From a paper:
Transcription of the ribosomal RNA (rRNA) precursor by RNA polymerase (Pol) I is a prerequisite for the biosynthesis of ribosomes in all known eukaryotes. Here, we use single particle cryo-EM to solve the structure of Pol I from Schizosaccharomyces pombe (Sp) in a monomeric (apo) and an actively elongating form at high resolution, showing that Pol I cleft contraction upon transcription activation is common to both organisms. The architecture of Sc and Sp Pol I is similar, despite poor overall sequence identity. Nevertheless, we conclude that the principles underlying Pol I regulation ‘activation by contraction’ and ‘hibernation by dimerization’ are conserved among organisms.
Pol I subunit A43 does not contain a connector element in Sp and therefore should be unable to form dimers, as inferred from connector deletions in Sc16. Taken together, we concluded that reversible, connector-independent dimerization of Sp Pol I is possible. A three-dimensional reconstruction of Sp Pol I dimers at 4.5 Å resolution was obtained in C2 symmetry. Unambiguous placement of two Sp Pol I monomers and rigid body fitting of subdomains yielded a model of the Sp Pol I dimer. Whereas establishment of Pol I dimers depends on stalk-insertion into the cleft of a second monomer in Sc, the Sp dimers form by interaction of the stalk with the protrusion domain of subunit A135 in the other monomer. A second interface forms between the ‘dock domain’ in subunit A190 of one monomer (including the Sp specific insertion of residues 580–587 and the Pol I specific helix α12a) with the wall subdomain of subunit A135, subunit AC40 and the common subunit Rpb12 of the second monomer. These two interfaces allow a tight association via the establishment of contacts between both Pol I upstream-faces independent of the connector element but utilizing organism-specific regions. Low-resolution density on the lobe of subunit A135 in both molecules in the dimers may indicate the presence of A49/A34.5. Further cleft expansion in Sc Pol I dimers likely results from mutual stalk-cleft insertion and is not observed in Sp Pol I dimers. Despite this divergence, functional importance is apparently conserved: Both molecules in a dimer are likely unable to initiate transcription since binding of the initiation factor Rrn3 to the stalk-dock region is blocked by the neighboring monomer.
Residue numbers in the entry:
A (entry chain P): 12 to 34, 44 to 59
B (entry chain M): 1 to 97
C (entry chain M): 1642 to 1681
D (entry chain R): 61 to 142
E (entry chain J): 1 to 68
F (entry chain M): 484 to 724
G (entry chain C): 117 to 232
H (entry chain N): 1029 to 1046, 1054 to 1120, 1128 to 1174
The structure:
Amino acid sequence: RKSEKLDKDASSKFLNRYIQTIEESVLSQLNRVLMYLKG
Amino acid sequence: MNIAQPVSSEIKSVKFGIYDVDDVEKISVKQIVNPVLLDNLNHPTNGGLYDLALGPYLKNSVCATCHLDERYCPGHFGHIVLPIPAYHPLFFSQMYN
Amino acid sequence: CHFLTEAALRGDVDDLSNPSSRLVVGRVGNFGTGSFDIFT
Amino acid sequence: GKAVAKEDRTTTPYMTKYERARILGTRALQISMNAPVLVDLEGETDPLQIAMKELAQKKIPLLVRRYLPDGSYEDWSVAELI
Amino acid sequence: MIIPIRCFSCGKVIGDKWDTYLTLLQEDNTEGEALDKLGLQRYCCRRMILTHVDLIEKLLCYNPLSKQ
Amino acid sequence: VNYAARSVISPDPNIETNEIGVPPVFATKLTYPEPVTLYNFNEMRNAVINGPHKWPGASHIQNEDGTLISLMPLTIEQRTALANQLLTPQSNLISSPYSYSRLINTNKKVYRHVRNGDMLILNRQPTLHKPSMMAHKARILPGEKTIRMHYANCNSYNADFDGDEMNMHFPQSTNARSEAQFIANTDSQYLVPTSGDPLRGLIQDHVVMGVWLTCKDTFYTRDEYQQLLFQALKPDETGMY
Amino acid sequence: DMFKWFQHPLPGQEATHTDYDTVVFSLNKKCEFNKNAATDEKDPKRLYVNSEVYSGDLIWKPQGRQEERFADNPIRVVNPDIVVAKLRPGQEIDLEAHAILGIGQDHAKFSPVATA
Amino acid sequence: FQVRTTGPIHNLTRQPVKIRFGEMERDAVIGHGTSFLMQDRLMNCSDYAQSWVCRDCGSIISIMSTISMNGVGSASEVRCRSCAKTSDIWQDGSGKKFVGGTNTTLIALPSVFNYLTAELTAMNIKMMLEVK
Amino acid sequence: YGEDSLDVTKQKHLTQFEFSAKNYKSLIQKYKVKSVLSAVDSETASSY
Amino acid sequence: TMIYLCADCGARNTIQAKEVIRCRECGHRVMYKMRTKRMVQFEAR
Amino acid sequence: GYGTVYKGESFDLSQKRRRGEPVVHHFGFAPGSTPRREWLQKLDADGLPFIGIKLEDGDPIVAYYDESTGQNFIETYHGTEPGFVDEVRLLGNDVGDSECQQIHVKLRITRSPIIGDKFSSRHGQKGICSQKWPTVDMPFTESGMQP
Amino acid sequence: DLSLYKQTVDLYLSIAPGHSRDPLNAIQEHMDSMILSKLPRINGIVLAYDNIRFLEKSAKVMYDSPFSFIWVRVDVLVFSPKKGDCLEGKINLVSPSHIGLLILGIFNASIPRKSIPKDWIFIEPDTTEEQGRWKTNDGNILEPGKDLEFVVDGQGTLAN
Ligand SMILES: [Zn+2]
Ligand SMILES: [Zn+2]
Ligand SMILES: [Zn+2]
Ligand SMILES: [Zn+2]
């Protein structure tokens, strides 16, 4: 149990990576948070 | 005894030790002050010796403390106070010596 | 009562050695098949 | 504490009279709880004896740990024990 | 609901003959007498696949377990 | 404790030195849990078919979540339906309770009666030394209402077979029953711990007629020899041969 | 003719089956939504898979010696083509059928001849 | 002749009410060196129970299931009173707000031991059993 | 322990030199020499 | 708990006794009970 | 002609909350004891019956218990013919923030053509199902289909 | 702000016996359960997890449960809105008793009128009674201002 520092771009790239690794509704709201963060 | 249980702990060591007055305050949930046990209503008097915050009574009562029936409430202790303090009768000889 | 109060004063810690103290805490004893552990 | 290195192992290379017992116990448990069997069945139904057929060929996972009273312990694969 | 197999009057089973007769009016340009190609010599087991209402294809569009 | 009967004993020479013959009553009133796999599926299903009032029927069901469906009130129709669906994913969620999904991998636990391969503990009060409490194989006998075992166990339990009853225990899990089956099985208690002297073995009648028969003055035609050899063997009740 | 009559079970009725009396079939279908659909064509035969529970989906389940006694003549529904019910994404039907010998004047389904 | 698969449990200690196994039999099973059998017959078949403990304070009674956090939501995550003092905080059956006492685990142990802890707390003497 | 060899159970025939030497062929396979001799040391202690 | 069906959204809700009743994903306030597997037997008449 | 009746009843707990107390009853069983001889066979666990289970007259339909008393009450099937249950409905009592105080059971009753029921062509020519003659004792055309 | 958090935690996972061939299987099996479900150990909601590696201990099996246990290291993506500082959301429902906002298109916010400064006023339309504009004190209208920035108390606050 421990924490580390992070910023938003690595969070976005990691979320992308996470959509990539694991392959429903979970992934749907993930798509939602994705199109929310970007642009 | 169920094979599907995931119990992950391990009791590693038991250690004894007396508890002070302060810790009894933190754990206890209630205090009994009324020597009355039951009312004409046949019901546990609040703050009384059958306090439903001490635990769920039978006849399908829910604990006032844990808000669950008697199947799942592990019972929650209470405390009764006295500004006397008299010595502890087990350590009596050791205390006096 | 006696051993009880005596252990209460000092507060000596057994880990748990005899399979009897093992037994009062429900865990298996340290003897027999219960001495060793099996893995994956 | 420490884990004893595989190179230096003083515990008896023999399958103790107790070790076989506990091993077969858990192997029956796994198999009974829908675990993969690494030996062909011969029509066998008791989930437990099946583990006997498994041990008889020593085709079995679930290495064992032998704890020295000091605090060290050995890790013996079932295929490595006698 | 569904086309009632084993017609009342006749003893002929007809439940098979529904989509096979539907795609006769549908694309064969022949009128209802395409059932004559089906082999319903009588009128009894004949008047079923003729004037049967297949309401269930409209009832089935009512799954509350449509997940949508 | 639970799952432990208590009955009067009478010996029997037919059964085994290992197995204990049990009346069907206990086989009904003593049941233990069992996960169901694909290959043991037919056995368990059959036991569930037989029902809770006919050996080797099954007691009742426990769901993977942990609940416990009984089997006395049902009819054999409902039994049949429950049995056919005794092995299937019935949990109506990947983890019905919360986000702790190990329940997808559990099985339906069938509580089944005891049968001819079961290991059930025997004991006697007072139990002085470890051969005074051992593990026996189960064989279910029909008819009698009294637990039967072989003489050769008389000596180890030292019981006089006058009425002195016994405690009859049954391990729940698989590891405990395997352990009783291998370490403390009656067959593994032949040399007492005090000295190496074996205590289990034959008694007055066996030693007597053994003396008589063994004497060189004896003779047998083919009929007697075959009948006697088979009579002792009876491999089928044991198998393996 | 290869069968023996069913003794209708009077009270005390449960255990009145055998393998020389009756036969059992089964079916179980859950219409899954088919994902290979291009667009909206409410056929729905191609929009969904197993939307129609036919008669060809009542599989005979042998009962012991039956499997052998009819190994020369495997028993089936004589019309494997009838549509029995219709299904859609999500729902399911699961059951098994018990068939015996019966005489027409008891039930019409027992009358074998379509028209005499 | 008395069979008992199960039945009534005691008022106080949840024991099958008044077959005897132990205190000489224990010598027997441990003579065979058959631990799992012992823990099976005397702990499992007799009184098996799950109870929480405060991992830090090491007490077994200062535990309590949290109360009325939100709707049915997630589980009522038990907490400790002795180790205590928006999501973290919670309330009491009487309404006393609190916080902390999070480090809580679930352990198997015979309920008769729980009774012992009860009547020993009745003496102000209590053990602080830790866990790993 | 207690002259380690073992409690009475498997030390009853240690004294029975003759009966061991009598057959020894059931026994040599019962002990499964081909496996034992693999992983164990023999000559050091036999020499000492 | 009990498992129900949000009428419109069509989403399993897993609600428990003595609880506010509504769809968790869309907010609907009407829900049916799913049909468990329960042995029922019928005659063919 | 296969008659199928839908008799739909609702149950509501507010009516038995006359005054003086808040909402007290809740559908299901008071935690603890529960009659099995009928109830658990019909009522699923929620005090609500199984979906599609056959009922009879003297048969519980739904179960609510009082909070204070902690005792289970029951509702029987007034009707006097075997009826099943096609669906049960948990009515959100209000805008929200309300326990399920209304339930709706839709019972399906089967009415095949029975002796004593009425038929009529579209000319007012009403008739009555008298005997359901055996299909073989019926006359037939030269084609043979029976009337 | 930087309300996003990734934290490599170590857990005591319960490996099923049937997945004894590969632990990663049963690990991800329930790891897909933690996603989007609050990990209370850290008090946040799982958003992502990778680096599924176990401290190799050839997992010790329970004494009587065939499913074993092992420590595994994985990296979570909890989002911690612990009343830190200014965050922002898209308004979805607006009515003069509280305002409903969506943060990150998922999570909800009910800022009541009391945590809102009294100076802002609501307009109750003709087509809709409650679906209307909580026009600010400035008079700026808030629906097309779908984004509202605010501070969190745990639950939101608009009072300054
Ligand atoms: Zn409580
Ligand atoms: Zn016709
Ligand atoms: Zn604490
Ligand atoms: Zn909804």
